[PDB]
Amino acid sequence: HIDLSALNPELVQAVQHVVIGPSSLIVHFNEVIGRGHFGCVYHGTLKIHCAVKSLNRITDIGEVSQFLTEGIIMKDFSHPNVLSLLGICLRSSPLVVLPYMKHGDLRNFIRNETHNPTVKDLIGFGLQVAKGMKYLASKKFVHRDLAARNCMLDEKFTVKVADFGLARDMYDKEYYSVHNKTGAKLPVKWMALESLQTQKFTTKSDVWSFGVLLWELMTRGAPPYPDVNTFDITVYLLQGRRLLQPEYCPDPLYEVMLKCWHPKAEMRPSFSELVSRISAIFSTFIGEH
């Protein structure tokens, strides 16, 4: 039930634009297209193709006014490299309605044997992520879980930063480790040093994660630091170590990665700078699909 008075009065008007009437959404529960810890994702027809995420694997949604507020904030985000929220549908837990992303998550796409992106293509995927993150950062939004598994591609191969707001989940449980003091399940191999120490996330720790994501692109989806175990990553990094330069990664792109992993968070490049530097490197290449 929607209690309009429980919302901030400023936001009441925006509710009509986020809520999807059940007569407008056919959900095909016969075919799972995504699996999160908090719930499964299904085909949906809104005629446009959509992805419908359940949150029923969680025992409770939380404060319904807060859930709507998150929806309202999220729907106002609009950028070609950020996954949009189409809306929220209520059933007698609510369903989150996202655009259909035909080619799935970026990591699986670059690992796929049937597709063959060139080096220029891979750098271009990187640039598209950088633009999405420049936009999210301009809205003061900290992602906290940027990684190739958490970006998706549509039918035109447009790359979108995903896995945030009401779509946030663990879609590959392998890469999340339980903190012993806090219990939080953390993507430690994508995390900045300071975040591993404090569990505080900033746009500058998203930039660190972005550097790792660039490394994933250039290795076509290799797992980072395979011979390091979970929270021993802090010890590993503090030995004076970083991920090695992939074979087909240009020297300037590796230099970009090293700047993203700067020990001083404030000395890491902004996402605007990353878009600028990467656009330059991208422009030096010929040949792409």
Ligand SMILES: COCCOc1cnc2ccn([C@H](C)c3nnc4c(F)cc(-c5cnn(C)c5)cn34)c(=O)c2c1
């Ligand atoms: C091969 O892909 C077939 C298309 O299936 C789709 C098509 N479109 C979508 C759209 C959204 N989602 C959920 C809500 C979602 N939202 N963000 C993400 C994300 F960042 C990653 C994933 C994901 C799914 N599987 N994996 C490995 C990662 C799923 N994500 C989906 O799971 C989803 C699944």
